[PDB]
Every structure is written in structure tokens, then in C-alpha cells.
Amino acid sequence: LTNLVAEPFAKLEQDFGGSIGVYAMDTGSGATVSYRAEERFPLCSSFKGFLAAAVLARSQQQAGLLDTPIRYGKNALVPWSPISEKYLTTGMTVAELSAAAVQYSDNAAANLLLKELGGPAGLTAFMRSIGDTTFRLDRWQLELNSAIPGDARDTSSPRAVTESLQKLTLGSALAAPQRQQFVDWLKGNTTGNHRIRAAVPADWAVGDKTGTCGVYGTANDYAVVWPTGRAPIVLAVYTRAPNKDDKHSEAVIAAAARLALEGLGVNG
Amino acid sequence: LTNLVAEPFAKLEQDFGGSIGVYAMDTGSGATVSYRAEERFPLCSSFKGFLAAAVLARSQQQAGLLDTPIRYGKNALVPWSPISEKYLTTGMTVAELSAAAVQYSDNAAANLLLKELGGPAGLTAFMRSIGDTTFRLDRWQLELNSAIPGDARDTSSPRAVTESLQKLTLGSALAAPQRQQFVDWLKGNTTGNHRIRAAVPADWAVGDKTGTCGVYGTANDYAVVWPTGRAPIVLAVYTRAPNKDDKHSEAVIAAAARLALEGLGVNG
Numbered sequence: 001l002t003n004l005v006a007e008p009f010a011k012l013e014q015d016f017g018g019s020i021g022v023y024a025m026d027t028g029s030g031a032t033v034s035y036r037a038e039e040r041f042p043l044c045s046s047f048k049g050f051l052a053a054a055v056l057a058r059s060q061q062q063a064g065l066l067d068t069p070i071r072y073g074k075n076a077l078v079p080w081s082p083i084s085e086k087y088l089t090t091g092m093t094v095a096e097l098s099a100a101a102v103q104y105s106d107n108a109a110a111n112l113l114l115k116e117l118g119g120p121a122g123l124t125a126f127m128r129s130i131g132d133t134t135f136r137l138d139r140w141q142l143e144l145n146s147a148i149p150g151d152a153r154d155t156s157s158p159r160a161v162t163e164s165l166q167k168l169t170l171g172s173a174l175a176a177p178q179r180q181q182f183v184d185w186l187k188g189n190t191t192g193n194h195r196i197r198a199a200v201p202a203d204w205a206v207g208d209k210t211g212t213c214g215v216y217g218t219a220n221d222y223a224v225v226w227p228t229g230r231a232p233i234v235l236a237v238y239t240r241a242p243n244k245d246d247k248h249s250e251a252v253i254a255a256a257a258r259l260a261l262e263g264l265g266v267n268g
Numbered sequence: 269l270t271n272l273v274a275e276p277f278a279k280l281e282q283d284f285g286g287s288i289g290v291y292a293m294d295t296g297s298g299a300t301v302s303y304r305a306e307e308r309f310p311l312c313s314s315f316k317g318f319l320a321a322a323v324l325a326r327s328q329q330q331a332g333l334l335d336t337p338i339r340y341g342k343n344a345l346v347p348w349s350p351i352s353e354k355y356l357t358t359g360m361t362v363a364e365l366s367a368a369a370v371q372y373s374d375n376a377a378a379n380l381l382l383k384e385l386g387g388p389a390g391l392t393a394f395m396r397s398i399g400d401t402t403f404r405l406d407r408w409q410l411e412l413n414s415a416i417p418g419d420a421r422d423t424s425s426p427r428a429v430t431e432s433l434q435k436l437t438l439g440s441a442l443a444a445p446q447r448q449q450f451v452d453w454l455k456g457n458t459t460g461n462h463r464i465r466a467a468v469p470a471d472w473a474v475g476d477k478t479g480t481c482g483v484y485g486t487a488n489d490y491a492v493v494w495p496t497g498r499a500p501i502v503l504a505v506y507t508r509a510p511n512k513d514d515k516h517s518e519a520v521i522a523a524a525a526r527l528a529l530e531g532l533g534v535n536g
């Protein structure tokens with residue numbers, strides 16, 4: 001049921017000047033679209049969705065975790081911390097930091113939560129616990145964005161990203177209240193309007209998390225999409241390019257998402 | 269007279285897993301072999317040959333320059349300074365530093381001479397003065413070895429390297445005594461036995477300068493070769509590869525030199 005209908009991913013990535021990786025699953029039938037789906041691509045900020053899921057998993061064994069206040073110093077603020085910088089003088093709860101990391105890609109919030117989980121190895125351990133053997137986080141922000149060609153640090157594959165997203169949003173990896181909170185955070189993301197969402201009709205529900213490394217044409221997005229009247233779709237689109245100064249493209253991510261939905265026979 | 273005889277450079281670079289750039293000139297007939305010859309490749313230590321030629325050019329207007337003693341501190345010693353480290357407590361002359369830079373690829377010696385010439389811009393100005401509009405040096409050692417894909421800093425092309433080498437060793441860019449000293453330094457190089465020299469019969473004279481960046485499979489060599497009974501050949505072989513951890517190959521440089529000589533119809 002993989003690639004029943006061929007789509008012109010190769011021409012798209014040639015126009016882009018780099019590499020595109022796509023996996024998409026129709027959770028009703030099991031049909032899939034797959035292009036470079038087992039290659040490694042840099043995660044960039046897309047690790048933050050899985051980080052919020054790990055926080056939610058911990059909250060199942062710590063009833064008070066999400067409402068715990070967290071105070072931090074100015075040394076915790078790194079570039080692109082649009083929400084956490086406004087609460088420097090007050091602190092924020094664990095849930096508020098998780099929402100900021102997911103919905104505004106707040107960099108400081110995600111570094112604070114990563115510390116709470118035991119660092120890059122602690123998030124990797126959570127991903128192993130749900131059966132993902134591909135994901136690896138190795139460094140902190142902003143260092144994890146280097147996107148060096150051939151470097152496996154801070155990478156995963158489109159397929160493993162999609163499979164783990166399905167387990168966390170639609171499967172049983174989280175208990176039902178935590179699962180719906182994860183979905184709600186993804187649905188409220190503000191940074192993805194020009195990526196997968198640009199290929200999705202306005203009357204369908206959709207949640208996503210973006211990543212943008214800033215070098216090597218490297219950017220990405222993953223999403224759960226609920227077309228009306230049929231089962232949800234889960235998909236991941238990752239990009240990279242050979243030269244450090246190559247620019248990323250939001251339009252290419254949107255176009256690859258359109259091809260994936262067309263390959264699954266979903267009318268849009 | 270370019271590429272009268274095709275050679276399998278593409279299969280060689282595919283076996284290597286990267287890109288190879290070759291220019292070779294028969295100075296008797298003007299026939300040339302050219303493959304990726306106008307692409308930019310990192311210079312790495314190959315800039316040091318041109319640096320020694322620039323020192324020689326200056327010596328034409330300063331009779332005492334070559335025998336001027338130079339004393340330096342331990343802070344001038346950078347990794348891979350095998351000759352200059354043995355004269356830390358005594359100093360070395362300008363000529364001795366030039367010989368060390370050319371023949372042992374001594375890193376500290378080349379940084380001291382670059383300072384004497386007014387830095388990377390001063391060496392670039394010398395190359396412009398002999399008609400080379402392609403060469404650029406931008407940084408000091410060891411920083412100039414980063415070999416980042418797409419970065420034009422500290423690069424030239426195989427063709428421009430060969431054309432400038434011809435002007436300096438066989439043409440009129442240097443006065444006759446300085447020209448022969450440059451040739452003698454190149455003939456005494458010790459670091460190139462597994463590169464162009466490995467394709468050259470033992471009974472032919474040959475001088476060369478190597479470069480090895482340490483990343484991105486990036487290494488190179490250029491040479492003047494005097495086959496007996498015919499005019500000299502000038503050639504340059506540069507390599508790079510897409511991933512930071514890709515290894516360079518001396519054997520590929522030797523093999524590309526063999527193809528270049530075969531393409532020119534020189535029996536070896």
C-alpha cells in the first residue's frame with residue numbers, strides 16, 4: 001500500500017536545489033506515501049513537539065507537574081524567545097513553557113524543559129520508550145541547528161517522526177487527557193501557516209510543529225490532519241541542501257505536502 | 269585543443285564519492301585537459317606556494333629580504349609546524365621560512381610570511397598583479413581550512429592555479445634568479461610523494477605543492493613536470509566531497525594526474 005500513485009517529488013527537490021523527505025500515512029486504510037522517508041534530516045526545532053509529549057507523559061505520574069511554577073534568569077534567554085522573555089520577571093508554569101515551545105517555537109522555554117527531562121539523552125530515552133529507534137537528540141539549543149551534511153547528531157527520519165507522532169496523538173502512548181492536551185497544543189501552533197497548513201483546506205482540523213535550522217536550506221514540518229468524513233492523516237516533510245548558505249523554502253514544504261495528500265487520494 | 273581525448277574523470281569522482289577538478293597544459297603545443305576546471309575548490313595549504321612566489325617577487329626590490337632573520341614567540345606556533353618548532357629559540361631567515369612552508373607545509377612559517385606580506389589581502393593583491401582574477405585568500409591558518417560547501421573564501425579554480433603556476437615557474441612573472449629559486453623549492457617538496465609525483469616516472473624532474481584541509485574530503489596538489497625530450501607540463505588536481513566527515517584520498521589525486529597525462533598523449 002506504499003506509493004500506489006507516483007508523485008513528482010524528484011522534480012520538486014531538483015527545483016529546490018536540495019533534498020526532500022516525505023512520509024504520510026492514511027490511518028484508515030494504512031496506505032502510505034514515501035520519498036526519502038528513511039534518510040536522516042536535522043530535526044531543528046521540530047524536537048520541541050516530542051519534548052512537550054515527554055513532559056505530558058511525566059505528568060501522568062506527577063499530578064502537580066504541569067502547574068509547577070518555574071523561575072529563570074536572564075542567562076536562560078537565548079535568541080528567539082518571544083514568550084519567555086515577557087515572563088522573565090514573573091516565571092511561567094511547566095504547561096505554559098510547553099505551550100510556548102510548541103506554539104511559538106520559543107527557544108528558551110524548550111531549553112528549560114529539556115533540562116527538566118535530563119537533557120538530550122532524556123528526550124531520546126522517552127522516544128525509545130515509545131518504540132522509536134531512529135530519533136536522536138545530542139545537543140542543546142542553539143548548537144543543535146548546525147545541520148552539517150552527513151552529521152547524524154540531532155536528526156531523525158520522516159518515517160520515524162510520522163510513526164511517533166501517530167502513537168502520541170492517535171495511539172495509546174499517552175493517556176487520554178494528556179493525548180488531547182498534546183493535540184490541542186499542536187492545533188494552536190502559530191509558526192506553520194506557510195507549510196503543511198497551506199496545503200490543507202480551511203474546514204479541516206490540523207495541528208503541527210515546524211523547524212528551521214537557519215543553514216543548509218534545512219527546514220521542516222510535521223502534522224496531524226483531520227479531513228472531514230474520513231480517518232486522520234499523519235505526515236512529515238523535511239528538507240536540506242548541500243551548501244551552508246542555501247536558503248530554505250516554505251513553499252517547497254507546502255508543495256510536498258500537497259503531493260503527499262494527492263498521493264493518498266484525499267480530495268482537497 | 270582542449271580535451272582532444274576523453275578520459276573517465278566522472279567514474280573516478282563517483283568512486284571517490286565527491287568532486288574532482290583537473291587542469292593540465294602541455295606548454296609545447298598548447299593542448300589542455302580540463303574537467304570541472306573553472307569550479308572553485310578550497311586552496312588549503314596550496315596557497316603557500318604562491319606565498320613563497322610573492323616573497324620572491326618582493327625580494328627583487330629588496331636585495332636583503334631573503335637573508336633577513338625572523339624571531340618569533342611560542343604563540344606563533346600552531347599545529348603542524350615541524351620545522352619552525354625546531355628553531356623557536358633561534359629564529360629563521362625569510363628564505364628558510366619560505367622553504368619550510370613549501371617543502372614541509374609548515375603552518376607557523378606560512379602565517380609569519382603572510383603577516384610580512386600584509387595578510388590574506390596582500391597575497392590576493394600579488395595574484396592580481398600577475399593577472400589571476402580568480403584566486404582569493406580571505407583568512408589565516410588554521411581557519412582557512414574549513415572547506416565549507418558553497419563558501420568561496422580561500423578558494424581558486426584548477427585552471428587559474430595552473431595558469432598562475434606556469435607564469436611563475438616558466439613565464440616572466442619573476443626574474444630569472446627568483447624563478448629558478450621557486451622551481452628549486454617546489455622540486456624539494458617532501459609532502460607530495462603519494463599525489464601527482466606517484467603518476468610521474470622517476471627519471472622526470474617534478475616540483476609540487478600539496479594541500480589537505482582535514483574536512484569535506486578536501487585535498488589537492490599542483491605541479492610542474494619536465495618529461496625528457498619535450499616541453500614541460502603544468503597541472504592542478506583539486507578534490508572536495510559533500511559531507512564534513514568524508515575522507516580525502518591521495519590515490520584519487522594520483523589517478524587523476526595519470527588520466528591528465530594520458531589525455532595529453534604523454535607516454536609514461
Ligand SMILES: *C(=O)[C@@H](NC(=O)Cc1cccs1)[C@@H]1N=C(C(=O)O)C(=C)CS1
Pocket residue numbers: 044045046080104105107142145191209210211212213214
Ligand atoms: C527551531 O527551529 C528554532 N530555530 C533556530 O533557533 C535557528 C534560527 C534562528 C533564526 C533563524 S533560524 C526556532 N524555530 C523556528 C520554527 O519553528 O520554524 C523558526 C522559524 C526560527 S526560531
Ligand SMILES: *C(=O)[C@@H](NC(=O)Cc1cccs1)[C@@H]1N=C(C(=O)O)C(=C)CS1
Pocket residue numbers: 312313314348372373375410413459477478479480481482
Ligand atoms: C595545509 O593544507 C595544512 N593543513 C592543515 O593545517 C589542516 C590539517 C591539519 C591536520 C590534518 S589536515 C598542512 N598541509 C598539509 C599538506 O600540504 O597536505 C597536510 C598534510 C596537513 S598540515
